[PDB]
């Protein structure tokens, strides 16, 4: 059977245009689609269907079909899934499972399929697009997990019981499984779940809101103080207790930037008082479910990226840094994506929802290649920005390991 | 000769009702003619005499040499549901794989060859008048896709496609391009084999009622939006600039238009002087005398255009290469070829008059439009041949505040080259003067002052009538650069300067910034330092 899935009130279907795809990618989707077509998951559609959703392929030599239901999902009626087990976040190790395959079984309300229309492009437009719509639950649509709920718990209990020491969290096509076992004993308990499923490595507690550390020096020059004093100023927006009078007082006059200055005991105390304030995160920052969760990333350079998740300005729910991965040496876009995906999985793990990203990159640039390195079953929301010079100088100033 | 095809389920927009527009009155000469045609079409099975109670109607017209019908569905159309965008992204010669042979097939009145959702027909009702607003005229409605109806093109297209799936599967080494009322069928078979597969195709088409016509039979080259399609290469159709001893505004605009489109395919076409003539114009018909200079440039173009450029077709087994050149600040030229000198495509990117950019950036943006363009055309990315030292590239990108990237490329020395016109020092310059700039302006009175004080006691303050807050800040900076030596340290509290730092632009909109850049570019070493104000 199938449950009547309607759109939210007064909402029409998605009409997102398919951005260009590489030949390779196209040849795959055709294969992946002809197949599914036969197996009855999807059916060719006519022109009387005006809706459309972007789709593409990701990476074995096999390709996955990734459909972008962001817009449909936004317009799909709400279902008030599974609440966030505040425990999944506190677990020595978490592994994720792709269970999107699950939905291929269940049929989809025929009156709603139209809205699932998507299109495979043709190189140079030498052919019409190949239109399809779904007959079953689509991987990527929030309605899928929700509808495949009753049936997921079912297949789930047994392992939940066989192991109540482990916690399971399902988000969209994903299954986040958490435990504390030793590696072998953990990874081995997973496959036990795998096979269980087949018949039908994150370390959360290691994360933390790293602190800011001001530079310390034998000798300080005008310039130096100006920089320190500059960064502190900005920081006062987060910590009102930070004060720079006795510091700006060392800059009273028009001397060379290079000249060295002896700090007063006053200025020295002043610094000490600030280091302390920065010793911990600003008090009072708590998460609010009813509000959007935001994520801002900055290109610190040298493969370095700083991000901050927050819902209100200067009230971070977490802050971090990310160094490029071996091999991305000449590719920003690659780092950013990985970054995004990583910040997104983290986000999900803690609050069960993807954040809205403010990406320091040009739309065009991003939209072209992002698909080339993307690897998650879901897709976050994003907007493109122009990073404020200080916001970067500020977080660049974070703390790293003594050695590593 | 209609079609045994399954109709498409067409609905009217949300709620809206069928058209109820009043039938424009016509003369006996015209009425008698429309009756003629409709009786003919009535026979063919195309339309239907229908009875009353079809509140819907559309105004039929008769035009000319023999009388031709012409129903106006504008309303039916604005009330008709939306369909998927009929192919609105047309190919490009450069992306076509050459084939030994190509045949064009005319599936003209195939529109009338396709059935209409019998359930929707009722809306297509219209009426042939009597001699005066006399008695009730003759009433009909379409049983097939009507010419001029919102969904005909789409549906026809779809159908044609359904209909061709068999034949395509059967003979895959045969490419069919459905474009409008034409089927371009090309292959690598022997002219005889070809001719026969075409004839087979033809027959398979009639098998579905798509009566395909020799008098009309198209032949090469084939005309396609300014392109001539020859077997070995395509070419740009003749572009003409009409001469006159008189030119109105409109004329100079249209021209400029056409000339502008040519800049792409044709190298250095220019319009600076023609465009120069549109200044202070008062009416499109107004007559502007062409200066000497414009007369001189309008001349050269006529000569550039009188030199038609051809292009090659696409060979999948060969490399995709793209060379990019800088034809002026923020202006670029590019050409994509497989074999040296046999271009598939060329083009040029106008000068985005931005608020503040740098060449490495703009170069970067050019590469992107191109890449996207190629993906679309060939479904691949080219190998780039760019006029920028791998070091300059590494040096810039490695520090820029914004994510960026260039696909696989290579350096090529075809000047001018793109470079970083200056690089702010990473640290204060020792033994170099340090200017402390500041600027103030009463945003209201636009009365301001801007100046500096150096470590060496040098000072200055200039007054500014009709200025703004930023204009002084940046001014304070200009002066400092002006009055300083080849190496300066400049400290400012201008958040705007903070921008110039992170971006180190080398071109802008404001002459002021522009000036600063000039001084910047000149100095051997400059260190910019921002510091909070107040
Ligand atoms: C779409 C197909 C049919 C096709 C064509 C036509 C064609 C291509 C683009 C737009 C309209 C028609 N040509 C264009 O070549 C023209 C030509 C070929 C052979 C003899 C004379 C002219 C080609 O070289 N290869 C092809 O596969």
UniProtKB/Swiss-Prot annotation, chain A:
Annotated Reverse transcriptase domain residues: 39-202
Effect of residue 67 to M: Confers resistance to stavudine and zalcitabine
Effect listed in the UniProt record for changing residue 66 to V: Confers resistance to abacavir, didanosine, HBY 097 and zalcitabine
Effect seen on changing residue 167 to D: Confers resistance to efavirenz, tivirapine and trovirdine
Effect listed in the UniProt record for changing residue 67 to L: Confers resistance to HBY 097
Effect annotated for changing residue 80 to G: Confers resistance to pyrophosphate analog PFA
Effect annotated for changing residue 36 to L: Confers resistance to zidovudine
Substitution effect: residue 354 to I: Confers resistance to abacavir, lamivudine and zidovudine
Effect of residue 49 to D: Confers resistance to stavudine
Effect of residue 178 to E: Confers resistance to efavirenz, nevirapine and quinoxaline
Effect of mutating residue 89 to P: Confers resistance to TMC125
Result for mutant: residue 91 to R: Confers resistance to emivirine and trovirdine
Effect of residue 178 to V: Confers resistance to efavirenz and nevirapine
Record note on what altering residue 89 to Q does: Confers resistance to efavirenz
Consequence of substituting residue 69 to L: Confers multi-NRTI resistance
UniProt-reported outcome of changing residue 103 to F: Confers resistance to abacavir
Outcome following mutation: residue 202 to A: Complete loss of RT dimerization
Mutation effect (residue 123 to L): Confers resistance to delavirdine, efavirenz and nevirapine
Listed result of changing residue 123 to M: Confers resistance to delavirdine, efavirenz and nevirapine
Stated consequence of mutating residue 198 to W: Confers resistance to zidovudine
Effect of residue 172 to T: Confers resistance to abacavir, didanosine, emtricitabine, lamivudine and zalcitabine
Outcome after substituting residue 149 to L: Confers resistance to pyrophosphate analog PFA
Entry binding sites for Mg(2+) 1: 98, 173-174
Protein name per UniProt: p51 RT
Native species: Human immunodeficiency virus type 1 group M subtype B (isolate HXB2)
Residues of the full protein shown: 593 to 1023 of 1435
């Amino acid at each position: 059977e199938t449950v009547p899935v309607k759109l939210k009130p007064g909402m029409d279907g998605p009409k997102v245009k398919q951005w260009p795809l590489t030949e390779e990618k196209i040849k795959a989707l055709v294969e992946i689609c002809t197949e599914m077509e036969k197996e009855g998951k999807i059916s060719k559609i006519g022109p009387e269907n005006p809706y459309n959703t972007p789709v593409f392929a990701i990476k074995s030599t096999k390709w996955r079909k990734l459909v972008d239901f962001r817009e449909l999902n936004k317009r799909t009626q709400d279902f008030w899934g599974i609440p966030h087990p505040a425990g999944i976040k506190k677990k020595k190790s978490v592994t994720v499972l792709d269970v999107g395959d699950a939905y291929f079984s269940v049929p989809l309300d025929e009156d709603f399929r139209k809205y699932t229309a998507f299109t495979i492009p043709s190189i140079n437009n030498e052919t019409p697009g190949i239109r399809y719509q779904y007959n079953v639950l689509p991987q990527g649509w929030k309605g899928s997990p929700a509808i495949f709920q009753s049936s997921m718990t079912k297949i789930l209990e047994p392992f939940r019981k066989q192991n109540p020491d482990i916690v399971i969290y399902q988000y969209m096509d994903d299954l986040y499984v958490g435990s504390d076992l030793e590696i072998g004993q953990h990874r081995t308990k997973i496959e036990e779940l795998r096979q269980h499923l087949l018949r039908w490595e994150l370390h959360p507690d290691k994360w933390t809101v790293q602190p800011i550390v001001l530079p310390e020096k034998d000798s300080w020059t005008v310039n130096d103080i100006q920089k320190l004093v500059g960064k502190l100023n900005w920081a006062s927006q987060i910590y009102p207790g930070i004060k720079v009078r006795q510091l700006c007082k060392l800059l009273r006059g028009t001397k060379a930037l290079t000249e060295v200055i002896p700090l007063t005991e006053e200025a020295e105390l002043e610094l000490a008082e600030n280091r302390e304030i920065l010793k911990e995160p600003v008090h009072g920052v708590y998460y609010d479910p009813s509000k959007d969760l935001i994520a801002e990333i900055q290109k610190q350079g040298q493969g370095q990226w700083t991000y901050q998740i927050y819902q209100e300005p200067f009230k971070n729910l977490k802050t971090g840094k990310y160094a490029r991965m071996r091999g991305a040496h000449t590719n920003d876009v690659k780092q950013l994506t990985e970054a995004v995906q990583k910040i997104t999985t983290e986000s999900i793990v803690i609050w069960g929802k993807t954040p809205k990203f403010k990406l320091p990159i040009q739309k065009e640039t991003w939209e072209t290649w992002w698909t080339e390195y993307w690897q998650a079953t879901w897709i976050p929301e994003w907007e493109f920005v122009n990073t404020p010079p200080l916001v970067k100088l500020w977080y660049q100033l974070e703390k790293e390991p003594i050695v590593g | 000769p209609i079609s045994p095809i399954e109709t498409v389920p067409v609905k009217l927009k949300p709620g809206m009702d069928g058209p109820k527009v009043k039938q424009w009155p016509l003369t006996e000469e015209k009425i008698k003619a429309l009756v003629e045609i409709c009786t003919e079409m009535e026979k063919e099975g195309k339309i239907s005499k229908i009875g009353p109670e079809n509140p819907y109607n559309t105004p039929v017209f008769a035009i000319k040499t023999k009388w031709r019908k012409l129903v106006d569905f504008r309303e039916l159309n604005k009330r008709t549901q939306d369909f998927w965008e009929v192919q609105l992204g047309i190919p490009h010669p450069a992306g076509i794989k050459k084939k030994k042979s190509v045949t064009v097939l005319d599936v003209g009145d195939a529109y009338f060859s396709v059935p209409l959702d019998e359930d929707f027909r009722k809306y297509t009702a219209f009426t042939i008048p009597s001699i005066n607003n006399e008695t009730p005229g003759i009433r009909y409605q379409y049983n097939v896709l009507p010419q001029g109806w919102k969904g005909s093109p789409a549906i026809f297209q779809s159908s044609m496609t359904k209909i061709l799936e068999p034949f395509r599967k059967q003979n895959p080494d045969i490419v069919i391009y459905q474009y409008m009322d034409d089927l371009y069928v090309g292959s690598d078979l022997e002219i005889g084999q070809h001719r026969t597969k075409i004839e087979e195709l033809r027959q398979h088409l009639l098998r579905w009622g798509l009566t395909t016509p020799k008098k009309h039979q198209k032949e090469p080259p084939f005309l396609w939006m300014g392109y001539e399609l020859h077997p070995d290469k395509w070419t740009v159709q003749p572009i003409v600039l009409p001469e006159k001893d008189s030119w109105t505004v409109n004329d100079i605009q249209k021209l400029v238009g056409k000339l502008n489109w040519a800049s792409q395919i044709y190298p250095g076409i220019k319009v600076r002087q023609l465009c120069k003539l549109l200044r202070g114009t008062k009416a499109l018909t107004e007559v502007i005398p062409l200066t000497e200079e414009a007369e001189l440039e309008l001349a050269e173009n006529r000569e550039i255009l009188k030199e038609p450029v051809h292009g090659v077709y696409y060979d999948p087994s060969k490399d995709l290469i793209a060379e990019i050149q800088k034809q002026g600040q923020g202006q670029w030229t590019y050409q994509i070829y497989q074999e040296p000198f046999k271009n598939l495509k060329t083009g040029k990117y106008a000068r985005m008059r931005g608020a503040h950019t740098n060449d490495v950036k703009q170069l970067t943006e050019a590469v992107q439009k191109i890449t996207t363009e190629s993906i679309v055309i060939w479904g691949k990315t080219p190998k780039f041949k760019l006029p920028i030292q791998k070091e300059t590239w590494e040096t810039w990108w490695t520090e820029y505040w914004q994510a960026t990237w260039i696909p696989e490329w290579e350096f090529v020395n075809t000047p001018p080259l793109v470079k970083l016109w200056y690089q702010l020092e990473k640290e204060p310059i020792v033994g170099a003067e340090t200017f402390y700039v500041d600027g103030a302006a009463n945003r209201e009175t636009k009365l301001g002052k801007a100046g500096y004080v150096t470590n060496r006691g040098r000072q200055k303050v200039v007054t500014l009538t009709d200025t703004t807050n930023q204009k002084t800040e940046l001014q304070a900076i200009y002066l400092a650069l002006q009055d300083s030596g080849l190496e300066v340290n400049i400290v400012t509290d201008s958040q705007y300067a903070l921008g110039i730092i992170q971006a180190q632009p080398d071109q802008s909109e404001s002459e002021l910034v522009n000036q600063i850049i000039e001084q910047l570019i000149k100095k051997e070493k400059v260190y910019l330092a921002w510091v909070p104000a107040h």
